[PDB]
Design an enzyme around this catalytic site. Structure first.
Site, PDB file in Angstrom:
ATOM      1  NE  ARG A 111      -2.732  -1.517   3.170  1.00  0.00           N
ATOM      2  CZ  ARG A 111      -3.194  -1.439   4.346  1.00  0.00           C
ATOM      3  NH1 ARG A 111      -4.104  -0.791   4.595  1.00  0.00           N
ATOM      4  NH2 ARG A 111      -2.758  -2.196   5.217  1.00  0.00           N
ATOM      5  CD1 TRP A 280       5.806  -4.921  -7.006  1.00  0.00           C
ATOM      6  CD2 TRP A 280       5.172  -3.419  -8.106  1.00  0.00           C
ATOM      7  NE1 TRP A 280       6.245  -4.064  -6.260  1.00  0.00           N
ATOM      8  CE2 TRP A 280       5.850  -2.795  -7.121  1.00  0.00           C
ATOM      9  CE3 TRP A 280       4.779  -2.613  -9.082  1.00  0.00           C
ATOM     10  CZ2 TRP A 280       5.701  -1.550  -6.773  1.00  0.00           C
ATOM     11  CZ3 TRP A 280       4.712  -1.124  -8.902  1.00  0.00           C
ATOM     12  CH2 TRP A 280       5.391  -0.594  -7.808  1.00  0.00           C
ATOM     13  CD  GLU A 285       2.066 -11.786  -3.610  1.00  0.00           C
ATOM     14  OE1 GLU A 285       0.723 -12.044  -3.943  1.00  0.00           O
ATOM     15  OE2 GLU A 285       2.485 -10.772  -4.061  1.00  0.00           O
TER      16      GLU A 285
HETATM   17  C1  HEM Z   1       2.095  -2.551  -6.204  1.00  0.00           C
HETATM   18  C2  HEM Z   1       2.619  -3.718  -5.732  1.00  0.00           C
HETATM   19  C3  HEM Z   1       1.785  -4.565  -4.740  1.00  0.00           C
HETATM   20  C4  HEM Z   1       2.318  -5.628  -3.896  1.00  0.00           C
HETATM   21  C5  HEM Z   1       3.759  -5.523  -3.542  1.00  0.00           C
HETATM   22  C6  HEM Z   1       1.275  -5.975  -2.989  1.00  0.00           C
HETATM   23  C7  HEM Z   1       1.306  -6.982  -2.368  1.00  0.00           C
HETATM   24  C8  HEM Z   1       0.445  -7.761  -1.867  1.00  0.00           C
HETATM   25  C9  HEM Z   1       0.410  -9.144  -0.976  1.00  0.00           C
HETATM   26  C10 HEM Z   1       1.690  -9.807  -0.718  1.00  0.00           C
HETATM   27  C11 HEM Z   1      -0.904  -9.439  -0.560  1.00  0.00           C
HETATM   28  C12 HEM Z   1      -1.230 -10.789  -0.069  1.00  0.00           C
HETATM   29  C13 HEM Z   1      -1.686 -11.545  -1.231  1.00  0.00           C
HETATM   30  C14 HEM Z   1      -2.275 -13.120  -0.562  1.00  0.00           C
HETATM   31  O1  HEM Z   1      -1.494 -13.708   0.352  1.00  0.00           O
HETATM   32  O2  HEM Z   1      -3.304 -13.536  -1.038  1.00  0.00           O
HETATM   33  C15 HEM Z   1      -1.726  -8.517  -1.186  1.00  0.00           C
HETATM   34  C16 HEM Z   1      -3.119  -8.559  -1.127  1.00  0.00           C
HETATM   35  C17 HEM Z   1      -4.213  -7.524  -1.586  1.00  0.00           C
HETATM   36  N1  HEM Z   1      -3.785  -6.483  -2.581  1.00  0.00           N
HETATM   37 FE1  HEM Z   1      -1.928  -5.966  -3.102  1.00  0.00          FE
HETATM   38  N2  HEM Z   1      -0.068  -5.578  -3.638  1.00  0.00           N
HETATM   39  C18 HEM Z   1       0.347  -4.611  -4.773  1.00  0.00           C
HETATM   40  C19 HEM Z   1      -0.576  -3.989  -5.525  1.00  0.00           C
HETATM   41  C20 HEM Z   1      -2.173  -3.981  -5.297  1.00  0.00           C
HETATM   42  C21 HEM Z   1      -2.987  -3.037  -6.104  1.00  0.00           C
HETATM   43  C22 HEM Z   1      -2.469  -2.411  -7.260  1.00  0.00           C
HETATM   44  C23 HEM Z   1      -3.976  -3.103  -5.506  1.00  0.00           C
HETATM   45  C24 HEM Z   1      -5.478  -2.456  -5.767  1.00  0.00           C
HETATM   46  C25 HEM Z   1      -5.847  -1.555  -6.616  1.00  0.00           C
HETATM   47  C26 HEM Z   1      -3.937  -4.093  -4.427  1.00  0.00           C
HETATM   48  C27 HEM Z   1      -5.003  -4.562  -3.240  1.00  0.00           C
HETATM   49  C28 HEM Z   1      -4.937  -5.494  -2.557  1.00  0.00           C
HETATM   50  C29 HEM Z   1      -6.050  -6.432  -2.165  1.00  0.00           C
HETATM   51  C30 HEM Z   1      -7.689  -5.744  -2.150  1.00  0.00           C
HETATM   52  C31 HEM Z   1      -5.564  -7.434  -1.479  1.00  0.00           C
HETATM   53  C32 HEM Z   1      -6.256  -8.612  -0.372  1.00  0.00           C
HETATM   54  C33 HEM Z   1      -6.698  -9.751  -1.226  1.00  0.00           C
HETATM   55  C34 HEM Z   1      -7.276 -10.737  -0.468  1.00  0.00           C
HETATM   56  O3  HEM Z   1      -7.920 -10.396   0.414  1.00  0.00           O
HETATM   57  O4  HEM Z   1      -7.468 -11.929  -1.052  1.00  0.00           O
HETATM   58  N3  HEM Z   1      -2.733  -4.552  -4.259  1.00  0.00           N
HETATM   59  N4  HEM Z   1      -0.910  -7.461  -1.762  1.00  0.00           N
HETATM   60  F1  LIG Z   2     -10.621 -15.631   1.698  1.00  0.00           F
HETATM   61  C1  LIG Z   2     -10.011 -16.410   0.975  1.00  0.00           C
HETATM   62  C2  LIG Z   2     -10.433 -17.657   0.730  1.00  0.00           C
HETATM   63  C3  LIG Z   2      -9.655 -18.783  -0.091  1.00  0.00           C
HETATM   64  C4  LIG Z   2      -8.648 -18.325  -0.758  1.00  0.00           C
HETATM   65  C5  LIG Z   2      -8.100 -17.045  -0.508  1.00  0.00           C
HETATM   66  C6  LIG Z   2      -6.791 -16.602  -1.199  1.00  0.00           C
HETATM   67  C7  LIG Z   2      -6.865 -15.136  -1.542  1.00  0.00           C
HETATM   68  C8  LIG Z   2      -7.159 -14.896  -2.974  1.00  0.00           C
HETATM   69  C9  LIG Z   2      -5.732 -14.876  -2.614  1.00  0.00           C
HETATM   70  N1  LIG Z   2      -5.450 -13.460  -2.625  1.00  0.00           N
HETATM   71  C10 LIG Z   2      -5.163 -12.721  -3.784  1.00  0.00           C
HETATM   72  C11 LIG Z   2      -3.636 -13.369  -4.093  1.00  0.00           C
HETATM   73  C12 LIG Z   2      -3.065 -12.581  -5.230  1.00  0.00           C
HETATM   74  C13 LIG Z   2      -2.834 -13.101  -6.565  1.00  0.00           C
HETATM   75  C14 LIG Z   2      -2.233 -12.133  -7.426  1.00  0.00           C
HETATM   76  N2  LIG Z   2      -1.882 -10.867  -7.420  1.00  0.00           N
HETATM   77  C15 LIG Z   2      -2.054 -10.378  -5.963  1.00  0.00           C
HETATM   78  N3  LIG Z   2      -2.041  -9.178  -5.688  1.00  0.00           N
HETATM   79  C16 LIG Z   2      -1.925  -8.190  -6.758  1.00  0.00           C
HETATM   80  C17 LIG Z   2      -1.745  -7.066  -5.990  1.00  0.00           C
HETATM   81  N4  LIG Z   2      -1.976  -7.487  -4.817  1.00  0.00           N
HETATM   82  C18 LIG Z   2      -2.220  -8.836  -4.449  1.00  0.00           C
HETATM   83  N5  LIG Z   2      -2.773 -11.298  -5.116  1.00  0.00           N
HETATM   84  C19 LIG Z   2      -8.733 -15.923   0.319  1.00  0.00           C
END
Ligand code: HEM
Ligand SMILES: Fc1cccc(C[C@@H]2C[C@H]2NCCc2ccnc(-n3ccnc3)n2)c1
Ligand code: HEM
Ligand SMILES: Fc1cccc(C[C@@H]2C[C@H]2NCCc2ccnc(-n3ccnc3)n2)c1
Ligand SMILES: C[C@H](O)[C@H](O)[C@H]1CNc2nc(N)[nH]c(=O)c2N1
Ligand SMILES: C[C@H](O)[C@H](O)[C@H]1CNc2nc(N)[nH]c(=O)c2N1
Ligand SMILES: [Zn+2]
Lengths: 411, 407
Positions: A111, A280, A285
């Protein structure tokens, strides 16, 4: 009410006032904490206060709160709501909304970048072919030959809930998974069910270990349609290790663009059910979760054998050793191919600074410790030692049910 | 109100009903989760006693028995009479074991029923306390074959006659602030190491000086005692590959023994109740050794491994971290001192969870604390949803004595 969070490594104490602006429920009660639980059609009735709250936020952020422009907009939205039962966001409001949903995403460690988000407005899209075009453009823009750029593409909002736009893929780019008759899995086990749907919808699967899935796109509540992303638009990275030359012969690769495509974006009470976004990768991940989860590619053993580790006793920490070398490989391979990636040390350090800045400038930063702390080497990152408060602000990204479980098929 | 927890790696779903029994508050609200915060009369007493005796008598298949009713009656009279009451030995043991059973932050709870309870409620002086603690240490240590134990000192009366062990653990290494500005030994114990001196200790100002016991009996001023060195089992740390590792000069003690917690049973408060188990390897190698605010040896080790400490992305920290934890496990196993790796411990805890869900309707667990501080997602607990709530009997934190002590 003020709430203090302490970093137990630096003794830095921060005060949260922002949680007062929270409306949505957490899942926890005074008697139970649900902090580790993964997941604990709208009337004009509730819509205007949600609109008003958002417009109040928006106009405050632009230093025009209580202005005639502010009051006129409120008036216009109200009249539009009672006349049409919904309303349309201005482009400026949409951009603000999307950036703030990211800013508010307590599970995202990335963020610090929230204010640099390219917002593509696809609200004029009407068909699946149109969606595909927008998504292709997003992938090309976001990929940027390896110099990744954060982007989000926003399709028309929900109306009656019968005309939803949905990207059926969980991510824009993902590898197929195939259940073999012998019980084993080829490719990504996470994607077995979605892969079957694609095949059923007429996808001719190559049936390899790394087949990029087709897009399955639903416009305006119609049945979804299959599209293959132009291969030249899918940047992939062969995984090799800087010291271990046998690592390349594992045959691993990954895609460069992580793009979540199944979340719901809520802004001012409006629901955008198709809003793919991309940033990115943080290295873990891929290297920890995608490769080493037992329920994913699960390569820990094969790697450990090739490293000739003592695999008879877990107390040799062979798994920990193999896990580290894989994550070194992932980071090395991306950097060498000049594809944007961030290691978990860099990412978490930046997040701490982001969070401290947010507390000072904003009064808080909602954060989900369970998700913010990396899945390896937790306590040698500064976030592990950081107390965090989790609460829900709007605008927000929410989970929504998988569309195959809810879709009404037309035929 | 009937809650399910899912394991996301196995798809196993458990149903929790036990949380409904919980009484104390979590710090969370419907609007905010505080899961990562480290610390979020006669009439008060009898319902507390009643709740405890009800579960005690239920646990022995005698709920609604005359003996149950009689005991409830007897305790009720004793409270009305004395403003407190005394636990029968059987209840004291039950309560201690269940406080451990209910410790949502303890990953070692599969062992909960095999706790040795030492009743020290007849103790009256610091010398007496010292004797009980030596016996505890000797018993628990068992020449390296560690055994879980708790020693329970007299219960709180009027808060003026508290028994307190001032140390946070029975066995810890001293910490000294140099004029060089740095820190010699364990920085976590600088403040305690000073109070030892202010009260009369003679520090040998070293890096691994076993701290003396500061023991407070019956509200009196605490007295110093050196634990017999022969009772302090220590392990020199060596690596089974890197022969330079020994020259780091690291060692650790075998007995992890928490001494600063408050044990609450049936409303009664035991301010001095040191307990001990055995180490999970990461407590020493990740936390004690590699925390920035502790021994912080990561850099020195990385240097000796000749890693590229130029860029964080070489993961030199992670690489060194693994090797250190290998050395710790290797050293304890080689010297035959009980230790468990984080993989074995967490695998054991999953089994415990499933047992508890099956035989008790649930298991309170703090995920933030149960997931080990390295290699999180390659252990089963990472993928395990957990519900955290407070059941009693319980171990609670309590203020440091040196802020409250009416000298
Ligand atoms: C730009 C570099 C970014 C990095 C390094 C990053 C990193 C991460 C990581 C490591 C997670 C955890 C994902 C998982 O373990 O499932 C995450 C989740 C998330 N990111 Fe990012 N992210 C980036 C960009 C963004 C952007 C551009 C958005 C939206 C505009 C965003 C919104 C979210 C949301 C909503 C989650 C939660 C997903 C879930 O609950 O399944 N992120 N991010
Ligand atoms: F609440 C849940 C129930 C079952 C699986 C789960 C896994 C979450 C979907 C994975 N979260 C997104 C992983 C992902 C993949 C690719 N890009 C990114 N991404 C890109 C920017 N920020 C995050 N996140 C949650
Ligand atoms: C027998 C083997 C045992 C193992 C492997 C074990 C393991 C652990 C670990 C790793 C922690 C986290 C400590 C930290 O990170 O600070 C912990 C905490 C805890 N344990 Fe155990 N333990 C054992 C025995 C016991 C016993 C015998 C008791 C009590 C009778 C107990 C009660 C507790 C409590 C109350 C905590 C929370 C500490 C706190 O909140 O600061 N444990 N245990
Ligand atoms: F809330 C806090 C404020 C400052 C430090 C903190 C750390 C907690 C003391 C550590 N918890 C006990 C650590 C420990 C040491 C030795 N043995 C054991 N141990 C033995 C059996 N079970 C746990 N635990 C919390
Ligand atoms: C049960 C637990 O909440 C679940 O495994 C969580 C743990 N923390 C996580 N953290 C991140 N970043 N991503 C995840 O998928 C998860 N999974
Ligand atoms: C801020 C956070 O609550 C704090 O660092 C916690 C994290 N998880 C932990 N887990 C264990 N087992 N022990 C700890 O001391 C901590 N510290
Ligand atoms: Zn909570």
């Amino acid at each position: 009410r003020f709430l203090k969070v302490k970093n137990w490594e630096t003794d830095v104490v921060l005060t949260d006032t922002l949680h007062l602006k929270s409306t949505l429920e957490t899942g926890c009660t005074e008697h139970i904490c649900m902090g580790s639980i993964m997941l604990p059609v709208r009337t004009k009735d509730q819509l205007f206060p949600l609109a008003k709250e958002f417009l109040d936020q928006y106009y405050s952020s632009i230093k025009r709160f209580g202005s005639k422009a502010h009051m006129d907009r409120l008036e216009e939205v109200n009249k539009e709501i009672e006349s049409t039962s919904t309303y349309q966001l201005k482009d400026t409001e949409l951009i603000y909304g999307a950036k703030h949903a990211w800013r508010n995403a307590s599970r995202c460690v990335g963020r610090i970048q929230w204010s640099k988000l390219q917002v593509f407005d696809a609200r004029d899209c009407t068909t699946a072919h149109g969606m595909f075009n927008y998504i292709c453009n997003h992938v090309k823009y976001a990929t940027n030959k390896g110099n990744l750029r954060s982007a989000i593409t926003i399709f028309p909002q929900r109306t009656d809930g019968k005309h939803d736009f949905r990207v059926w893929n969980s991510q824009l780019i993902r590898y197929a998974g195939y259940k073999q008759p012998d019980g084993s899995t080829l490719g990504d086990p996470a994607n077995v069910q979605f892969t079957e749907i694609c095949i059923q919808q007429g996808w001719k699967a190559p049936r390899g270990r790394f087949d990029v899935l087709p897009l399955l796109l639903q416009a305006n509540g119609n049945d979804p349609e299959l599209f293959q992303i132009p291969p030249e638009l899918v940047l992939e990275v062969p995984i090799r290790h800087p010291k271990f030359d046998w690592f390349k012969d594992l045959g691993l690769k990954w895609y460069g663009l992580p793009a979540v495509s199944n979340m719901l974006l809520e802004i001012g009470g409006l629901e955008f059910s198709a809003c793919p976004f991309s940033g990115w990768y943080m290295g873990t991940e891929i290297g920890v979760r995608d490769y080493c989860d037992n329920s994913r590619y699960n390569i820990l053993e094969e790697v450990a054998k090739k490293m000739d580790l003592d695999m008879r006793k877990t107390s040799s920490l062979w798994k920990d050793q193999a896990l580290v070398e894989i994550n070194i490989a992932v980071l090395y391979s991306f950097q060498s191919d000049k594809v944007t990636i961030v290691d978990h040390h860099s990412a978490t350090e930046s997040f701490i600074k982001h969070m401290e800045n947010e507390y000072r400038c904003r009064g808080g930063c909602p954060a989900d410790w369970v998700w913010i702390v990396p899945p390896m080497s937790g306590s040698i990152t500064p976030v592990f030692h950081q107390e965090m408060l989790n609460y829900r602000l709007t605008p927000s990204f929410e989970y929504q049910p998988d569309p195959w479980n809810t879709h009404v098929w037309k035929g």
